[PDB]
Enzyme design. Structure first.
Site, mmCIF file in Angstrom:
data_model
loop_
_atom_site.group_PDB
_atom_site.id
_atom_site.type_symbol
_atom_site.label_atom_id
_atom_site.label_comp_id
_atom_site.label_asym_id
_atom_site.label_seq_id
_atom_site.Cartn_x
_atom_site.Cartn_y
_atom_site.Cartn_z
ATOM 1 N N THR A 207 57.067 -21.189 38.730
ATOM 2 C CA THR A 207 55.624 -21.205 38.494
ATOM 3 C C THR A 207 55.302 -21.630 37.062
ATOM 4 O O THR A 207 55.773 -21.004 36.115
ATOM 5 C CB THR A 207 55.032 -19.804 38.780
ATOM 6 N N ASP B 63 62.261 -11.438 45.415
ATOM 7 C CA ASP B 63 62.132 -12.893 45.502
ATOM 8 C C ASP B 63 63.201 -13.684 44.733
ATOM 9 O O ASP B 63 62.933 -14.299 43.694
ATOM 10 C CB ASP B 63 60.695 -13.341 45.153
ATOM 11 N N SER C 230 53.161 -13.395 52.302
ATOM 12 C CA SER C 230 53.129 -14.699 52.947
ATOM 13 C C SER C 230 53.265 -15.778 51.881
ATOM 14 O O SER C 230 52.700 -15.657 50.793
ATOM 15 C CB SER C 230 51.805 -14.865 53.695
ATOM 16 N N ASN D 5 56.413 -11.139 41.512
ATOM 17 C CA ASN D 5 57.778 -10.883 41.983
ATOM 18 C C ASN D 5 58.366 -9.550 41.511
ATOM 19 O O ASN D 5 59.588 -9.351 41.517
ATOM 20 C CB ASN D 5 58.691 -12.068 41.634
ATOM 21 N N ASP E 295 62.561 -16.954 38.508
ATOM 22 C CA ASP E 295 61.182 -16.862 39.009
ATOM 23 C C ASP E 295 60.523 -15.518 38.662
ATOM 24 O O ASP E 295 59.769 -14.962 39.466
ATOM 25 C CB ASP E 295 61.169 -17.091 40.534
ATOM 26 N N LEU F 5 53.202 -7.968 55.031
ATOM 27 C CA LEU F 5 53.343 -7.496 53.652
ATOM 28 C C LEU F 5 53.214 -8.610 52.631
ATOM 29 O O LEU F 5 52.998 -8.357 51.440
ATOM 30 C CB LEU F 5 54.683 -6.778 53.467
ATOM 31 N N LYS G 211 57.918 -13.061 37.362
ATOM 32 C CA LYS G 211 56.462 -13.060 37.192
ATOM 33 C C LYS G 211 55.949 -11.795 37.887
ATOM 34 O O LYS G 211 56.668 -11.213 38.701
ATOM 35 C CB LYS G 211 55.848 -14.336 37.786
HETATM 36 O O1 LIG Z 1 57.183 -9.579 49.761
HETATM 37 C C1 LIG Z 1 58.343 -9.183 49.616
HETATM 38 C C2 LIG Z 1 59.363 -10.082 49.319
HETATM 39 C C3 LIG Z 1 60.661 -9.587 49.213
HETATM 40 C C4 LIG Z 1 61.779 -10.353 48.878
HETATM 41 C C5 LIG Z 1 62.897 -9.690 48.372
HETATM 42 C C6 LIG Z 1 64.046 -10.389 48.021
HETATM 43 C C7 LIG Z 1 64.059 -11.765 48.196
HETATM 44 O O2 LIG Z 1 65.141 -12.504 47.849
HETATM 45 C C8 LIG Z 1 62.943 -12.434 48.712
HETATM 46 O O3 LIG Z 1 62.999 -13.793 48.868
HETATM 47 C C9 LIG Z 1 61.800 -11.727 49.054
HETATM 48 O O4 LIG Z 1 60.958 -8.280 49.389
HETATM 49 C C10 LIG Z 1 59.983 -7.410 49.745
HETATM 50 C C11 LIG Z 1 60.313 -6.089 49.991
HETATM 51 C C12 LIG Z 1 59.325 -5.192 50.352
HETATM 52 O O5 LIG Z 1 59.683 -3.913 50.587
HETATM 53 C C13 LIG Z 1 58.000 -5.604 50.463
HETATM 54 C C14 LIG Z 1 57.687 -6.934 50.208
HETATM 55 O O6 LIG Z 1 56.410 -7.399 50.293
HETATM 56 C C15 LIG Z 1 58.669 -7.854 49.844
#
Ligand SMILES: O=c1cc(-c2ccc(O)c(O)c2)oc2cc(O)cc(O)c12
Length: 274
Positions: free
Chosen positions: A177, A158, A20, A141, A136, A18, A138
């Site tokens: 960023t 994120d 990277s 995110n 962060d 999903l 953006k």
């Molecule tokens: O890439 C995704 C990244 C994250 C994510 C969510 C909370 C965080 O503190 C973090 O560091 C990453 O949550 C997702 C949740 C998803 O359902 C699909 C995704 O792609 C992500």
């Protein structure tokens, strides 16, 4: 804090990738006991104390602690945390409509923009109410629940740079960023909730125009532009945009954090307030 150290593969099956990033990968997964689906973010741990590769325990624990606190329709929900010698694994709510960044790549009307913005503002209002700065914000995110509806619902993700601001400011050399960071971040000054509101201003400019307000040809140029508040509303982009929308952006892209609109200010601004 220690996390569940059973093999994650004993309880979940992974599938499609999903997302990277530098020290992480996110995989779609399915919990065996419930059949429910999630996103598993595998975060690489530091292998030594003085290494610069992987994420420090301190940074990992801070992110988990913040995620455990939050429950709101516009913020991602944490389900479980596992770890092993190589990774900490966040089991996160599944959001299947992709990044706002990718949705934007396919400019909005002011209604479409405010539809998104109101939800971003509500999510940030929740966070700032708990004295949590995201640091962060953006389009990458912000995730959509479903991108084939007229008014997609969004969730902020994120939280890897997020901090509790219990003293009004934090002095940590936090840095996201270049296109989206506030001048106080660029200048390595104490940081608070205000930095998120600048980022919201940048996001709003992008939503309305499809252009980035401070973006230069190199990272150093972008940062220099941010510190100097070097942006303008190009007529080619903003000719059909209301003066109230520009006013909203102008009151967020303000160098002095004390003079910047707060999250509460942004919700009461005539462009937003219904
Ligand atoms: O890439 C995704 C990244 C994250 C994510 C969510 C909370 C965080 O503190 C973090 O560091 C990453 O949550 C997702 C949740 C998803 O359902 C699909 C995704 O792609 C992500």
């Amino acid at each position: 804090t220690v996390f569940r150290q059973e093999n994650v593969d004993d309880y979940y099956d992974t599938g499609e990738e999903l997302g990277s990033g530098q020290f992480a990968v996110v995989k779609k997964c399915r919990e065996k006991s419930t059949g429910l689906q999630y996103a598993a973010k595998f975060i690489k741990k530091r292998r030594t104390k003085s290494s610069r590769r992987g994420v420090s325990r301190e940074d990992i624990e801070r992110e988990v602690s913040i995620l455990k606190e939050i429950q709101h329709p516009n913020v991602i929900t944490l389900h479980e945390v596992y770890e092993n010698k190589t990774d900490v694994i966040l089991i996160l709510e599944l959001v299947a409509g992709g990044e706002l960044f990718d949705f934007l790549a396919e400019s909005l009307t002011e209604e479409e923009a405010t539809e998104f913005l109101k939800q971003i503002l509500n999510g940030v209002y929740y966070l700032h109410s708990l004295q949590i700065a995201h640091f962060d914000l953006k389009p990458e995110n912000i995730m959509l629940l479903d991108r084939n509806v007229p008014k997609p619902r969004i969730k902020i993700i994120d939280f890897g740079l997020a901090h509790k601001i219990d003293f009004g400011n934090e002095f940590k050399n936090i840095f996201g960023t270049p296109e989206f960071v506030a001048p106080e971040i660029v200048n390595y000054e104490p940081l608070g909730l205000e930095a998120d509101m600048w980022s919201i201003g940048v996001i709003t400019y992008i939503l309305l125009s499809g252009a980035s307000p401070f973006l230069g040809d190199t990272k150093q140029e972008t940062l220099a532009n941010v510190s100097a508040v070097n942006y303008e509303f190009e007529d080619e982009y903003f000719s059909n945009t209301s003066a109230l929308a520009k006013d909203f952006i102008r009151r967020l892209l303000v160098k002095d954090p004390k003079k910047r609109m707060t999250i509460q200010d942004s919700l009461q601004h005539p462009w937003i307030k219904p």
